[PDB]
């Protein structure tokens, strides 16, 4: 984006939005629970626990 | 149920390496996500993680014991080994085994905690307990038993075998100056139970491998 | 990583109290969540309160709740009884050092309770030890609340405080305090002394025993 | 896991392979090419440059 | 037609900011995953990389120089733009606009450089060049061909271009690399071998430009007889 | 992060010359795969030769290219022509650093040309320059092969090294090399000495020429 990369942080299936990110990488975490699979948004490539799935990627709008 | 029993030396030389087991009833040491690992307690100290391994052999380990840390387990048997090398007096303290019931992430679950093994880092050798009687309202009187100069720390007391539960209370130890430590146990009985019921106490030194029975008449 | 946990909270019977542990985003602000709150008794194995994403854990009453905001959680007990007084501890996880992580602890003081009046029980150096020319005079206090007592020993009628060595209070399982003070000389000591007596002042009250050879 | 985290490295749609990894974490990268999606598997979460999809997981044989 | 143009000072003072503009013909300046941005090359040094900004807008700075560098770009303007603050002498150099041609992932595509625009970081200012010229009895490279040239003698900063007969003569041509003397000021020469049966027919002119100092000095070789 | 490479490279014409640049996993070996060489005449900007995954550039001949073993890439040079003489350079880019990195460069030497004898052209202050009280005398050699040779100043006729510099040689459009070497003096130094001569050394031949001051 013009001022960092745009990332969206939408969780799971919400409505998709983005943010402004001073990380040149943007990641969409996924896990299970008893209400199902849970995806969660953002920029950078966080450290995950063991049963999460990470994935990230660097391009504007990649982590969807 | 879940069981979580520790077993191993009391006292280990600060030239050796601590090995521990436990044994684990009632939770799986098989999941991906769930751990079975060591916490530990130093006196005047806080809660410090050891380290964990999980269903799938994979060991995290606390990045300051690292080192000198190595945590294994035998499914077949259901239990989990620790052993920590390079010894100091720093690793005196009581090693709490623990499991984590997680099921679909890390730490997603209950944890259950075992009774613990107090382990002493010592050049010194084991020291067995001296127990001497304690005996001197007028509807019931307190007597009790004082174990004296032991070392380490781990005593354990019953009365009667266990069979006398009410009234009873043992205390905290102390460390004299002689450098061993001292703990009295006491427990109130009616007045009228003096002559005709039998009063006795089970000291138990782990460390000395000794169990002592003492009568208390006065 | 780094917990920080109040050192010690009080609070009355009844009332609603909160202790509070501070971390990053690494460990408790991490997602999805877990803080683990565990209750331990000084000189037992800790209990778990609260795991995982604030989840009560099974056999904990009601009154125990955990929740997180950012990189804080808190635990709160609403209504807090006497059987609550204990050191509580807070655990998290943290990803950037895959390891986890504990707080300093929390000393909760539940105070409020019925006061008790000391029993003491004063005995004499057995006839063994002095046997081994040593000599322990034991006083035991039980059964007192609030907490806090002080014990002084006298050597024959005036307070004397050589090798007196007392240990904190700990509850009973009635729910009172106990505490013993050890009295240690040498059995000639001992044997010349005219009277050793064990004092306690809890509540005001002042409750003296005394035992001569 | 005996000795280590077990991991897929098998490459885009080849028969799974599986090495076991000092690492506590697996990856799968994805990228595109004229031939069209490439995958590429193995052990640790190592970063990429931009335009490869990183996917990384912490338990045996999750890269798939 | 790929072409990547580079303009601005070649003189900056060591307490100002460097900007250099980079024109853009060819190139698309929106693909995510391709870049365009800077390299330097300072004198007897290697090739070090200033930075990049990609189709996004996502900048990668050379950590080095991450806290003085910031690229930007106009993509109406198909133009990107580099700035470095916190001058040096070491930041004296030739910097080069770059462009990557990639189309999958970062640098998986043909990279296009520009001709390179020559700074200089000096408290010092322009000095234009006088153009001495060199003819010589002794200048007899054959025997059917004599060699005449033109000195260009004390100028800075460095960047200097020569010609002869405004490009028209080529053949036989040869410009030397330059020299510091103990002035402070650089010197070069250039040459070109001529027919001798042409000294008295045809004209030679060289023509030295100077552009930190705007200045273009044409010089006609004049062989005259004593 | 740090590729290196080879400082020099040399090779004889036809023969085939590898140039090689060592790097780490995070920057070379990183996977899909990216290293650039490209070519520099000194003194004119850079062309890519090899980029991306070891792919030839648009109108590089077909002798030039490029491979990548584990963390090691490689140019390769195949039939090396007088025209390749020239500084290579390989570039990575590094995701630990997200930064591209740059080798220090190597030159890659082309030998086993046709002889060549250096042609001496020295030329005396101008007179302009000498309305100043400065003197230059100028001393071009061209059309040489190989490259290297020695220059010698001379006063009168004896050797002198002060306020003497030459440039290092630098090839022509033809093919060949040449040099400059600049004697500076006063004005009353250039007019009071009675022959300054400039001496090429190459190959074992001496080839000299002389000037003298003149009031022209």
């Known amino acids: 984006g013009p001022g960092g990369m745009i990332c969206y942080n939408q969780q799971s299936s919400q409505p998709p939005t983005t943010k402004t990110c001073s990380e040149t990488s943007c990641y969409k975490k996924t896990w299970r629970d008893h209400r199902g699979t849970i995806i969660e948004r953002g920029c950078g490539c966080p450290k995950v626990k063991p049963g999460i799935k990470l994935h990230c990627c660097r391009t504007d709008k990649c982590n969807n | 149920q879940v069981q979580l029993t520790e077993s191993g030396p009391g006292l280990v030389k600060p030239s050796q390496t601590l090995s521990l087991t436990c044994?684990?009833?009632?939770?799986?040491?098989?999941?991906?996500?769930?751990?079975?690992?060591?916490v530990r307690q130093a006196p005047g100290k806080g809660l410090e993680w050891?380290?964990?391994?999980?269903?799938?052999?994979?060991?995290?380990?606390?990045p300051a014991l690292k080192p000198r840390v190595s945590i294994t387990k035998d499914t077949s048997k259901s239990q989990v080994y620790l052993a920590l090398n390079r010894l100091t007096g720093e690793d005196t303290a009581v090693?709490?085994?623990?499991?984590?019931?997680?099921?679909?992430?890390?730490?997603?679950?209950?944890?259950?905690?075992?009774?613990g093994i107090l382990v002493t880092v010592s050049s010194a050798s084991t020291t067995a307990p001296k127990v001497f009687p304690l005996a001197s309202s007028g509807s019931t009187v307190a007597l009790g038993c004082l174990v004296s100069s032991y070392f380490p720390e781990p005593v354990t007391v019953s009365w009667n075998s266990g069979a006398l539960t009410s009234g009873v209370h043992t205390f905290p130890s102390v460390l004299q100056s002689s450098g061993l430590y001292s703990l009295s146990s006491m427990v109130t009985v009616p007045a009228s139970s003096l002559k005709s019921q039998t009063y006795i106490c089970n000291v138990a030194h782990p460390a000395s491998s000794t169990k002592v029975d003492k009568k208390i008449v006065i | 990583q780094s917990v920080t946990q109040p050192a010690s909270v009080s609070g009355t019977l009844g009332q609603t109290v909160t202790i509070s542990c501070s971390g990053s985003k690494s460990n408790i602000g991490d997602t999805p969540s877990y803080v683990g709150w565990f209750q331990q008794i000084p000189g037992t194995a800790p209990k778990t309160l609260i795991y995982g994403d604030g989840k009560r854990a099974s056999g904990v009453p009601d009154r125990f709740s955990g929740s997180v905001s950012e990189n804080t959680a808190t635990l709160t007990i609403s209504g807090v009884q006497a059987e609550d007084e204990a050191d509580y501890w807070c655990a998290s996880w943290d990803v950037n050092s895959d390891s986890e992580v504990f707080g300093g602890g929390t000393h909760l003081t539940v105070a409020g309770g019925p006061t008790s009046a000391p029993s003491v029980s004063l005995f004499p150096p057995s006839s063994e030890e002095l046997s081994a020319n040593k000599a322990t005079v034991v006083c035991l206090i039980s059964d007192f609340s609030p907490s806090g007592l002080e014990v002084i020993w006298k050597v024959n009628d005036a307070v004397t405080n050589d090798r007196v060595q007392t240990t904190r209070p700990s509850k009973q399982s009635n729910g009172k305090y106990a505490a013993s003070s050890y009295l240690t000389r040498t059995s000639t000591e001992w044997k010349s002394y005219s009277s050793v007596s064990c004092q306690v002042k809890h509540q005001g009250k002042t409750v003296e025993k005394k035992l001569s050879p | 896991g005996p000795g280590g985290m077990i991991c897929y490295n098998q490459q885009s749609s080849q028969p799974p392979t599986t090495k076991t990894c000092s690492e506590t974490s697996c990856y799968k990268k994805t990228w595109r090419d004229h031939r069209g999606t490439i995958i590429e598997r193995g052990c640790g979460c190592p970063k990429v440059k931009p335009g490869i999809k990183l996917h990384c997981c912490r338990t045996d044989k999750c890269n798939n | 037609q790929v072409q990547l143009t580079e303009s601005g000072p070649g003189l900056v003072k060591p307490s100002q900011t460097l900007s250099l503009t980079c024109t853009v013909s060819?190139?698309?300046?929106?693909?995510?995953?391709?870049?365009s941005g800077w390299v330097r090359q300072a004198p007897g040094k290697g090739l070090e990389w200033i930075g990049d900004?990609?189709?996004?807008?996502?900048?990668y700075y050379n950590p080095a120089l991450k806290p003085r560098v910031s690229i930007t770009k106009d993509t109406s303007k198909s133009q990107v733009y580099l700035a470095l603050n916190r001058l040096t002498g070491e930041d004296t150099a030739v910097y080069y606009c770059?462009?990557?041609?990639?189309?999958?992932?970062?640098?998986?595509?043909?990279?296009?450089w520009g001709q390179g625009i020559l700074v200089t970081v000096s408290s010092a200012s322009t000095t234009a060049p006088k153009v001495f010229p060199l003819a010589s009895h002794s200048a007899a490279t054959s025997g059917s061909t004599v060699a005449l040239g033109c000195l260009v003698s004390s100028y800075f900063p460095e960047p200097v271009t020569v010609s002869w007969n405004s490009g028209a003569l080529t053949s036989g041509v040869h410009t030397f690399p330059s020299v510091l003397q103990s002035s402070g000021l650089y010197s070069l020469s250039s040459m070109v071998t001529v027919p001798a049966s042409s000294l008295k027919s045809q004209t030679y002119i060289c023509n030295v430009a100077h552009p930190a100092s705007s200045t273009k000095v044409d010089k006609k070789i004049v062989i005259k007889e004593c | 992060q740090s590729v290196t490479q080879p400082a020099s490279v040399s090779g004889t014409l036809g023969q085939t010359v590898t140039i090689s640049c060592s790097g780490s996993k995070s920057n070379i070996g990183d996977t899909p795969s990216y290293v650039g060489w490209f070519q520099q005449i000194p003194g004119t900007a850079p062309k890519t030769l090899i980029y991306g995954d070891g792919k030839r550039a648009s109108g590089v001949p077909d002798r030039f290219s490029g491979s990548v073993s584990e963390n090691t890439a490689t140019l390769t040079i195949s039939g090396v022509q007088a025209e390749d003489e020239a500084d290579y350079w390989c570039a990575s880019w590094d995701v630990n650093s997200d930064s591209e990195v740059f080798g220090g460069g190597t030159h890659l030497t082309v030998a086993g040309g046709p002889t060549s004898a250096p042609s001496v052209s020295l030329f005396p202050p101008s007179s302009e320059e000498l309305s100043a009280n400065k003197a230059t005398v100028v001393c071009l050699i061209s059309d040489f092969s190989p490259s290297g040779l020695e220059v010698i100043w001379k006063v009168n006729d004896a050797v002198t090294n002060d306020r003497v510099q030459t440039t290092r040689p630098s090839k022509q459009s033809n093919g060949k090399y040449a040099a400059s070497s600049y004697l500076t003096r006063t004005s009353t130094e250039w007019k009071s000495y009675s022959s300054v001569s400039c001496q090429v050394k190459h190959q074992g031949k001496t080839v000299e020429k002389k000037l003298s001051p003149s009031e022209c």
């Open positions: 770059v462009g990557n041609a990639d189309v999958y992932y970062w640098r998986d595509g043909e990279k296009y």
């Open positions: 060819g190139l698309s300046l929106t693909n995510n995953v391709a870049g």
């Open positions: 900004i990609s189709g996004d807008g996502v900048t």
